Design a protein around this ligand. Structure first.
Ligand SMILES: [Zn+2]
Ligand SMILES: [Zn+2]
Length: 84
């Protein structure tokens, strides 16, 4: 029944996966122990020891430190897949 290898997926918190509503963007609270790049600014998003609360988009598939939202940075842009 299993004859299709994935591409290294990631199953975040299933208990309570909320969604950060924003300008055409619905980010999701999750962590990334692997090298993840933020969509907002141009900095690395990840951590081997203590992974910061990263927000992944449940549409175009992106990531942005929860910090950006908590700080409200204009750098963040609207989702692209939600229009094209
Ligand atoms: Zn950033
Ligand atoms: Zn998006």
């Amino acid at each position: 029944e299993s004859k299709k290898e994935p591409e290294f997926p990631v199953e975040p918190v299933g208990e309570k996966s909320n969604y950060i509503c924003h300008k055409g963007h619905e980010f999701i609270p999750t962590l990334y122990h692997f090298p993840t790049n933020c969509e907002a600014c141009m900095k690395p998003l990840w951590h081997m020891f203590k992974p910061p609360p990263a927000l992944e988009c449940r549409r175009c598939h992106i990531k942005c430190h929860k910090d950006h939202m908590d700080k409200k940075e204009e750098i963040i842009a609207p989702c692209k897949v939600y229009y094209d």
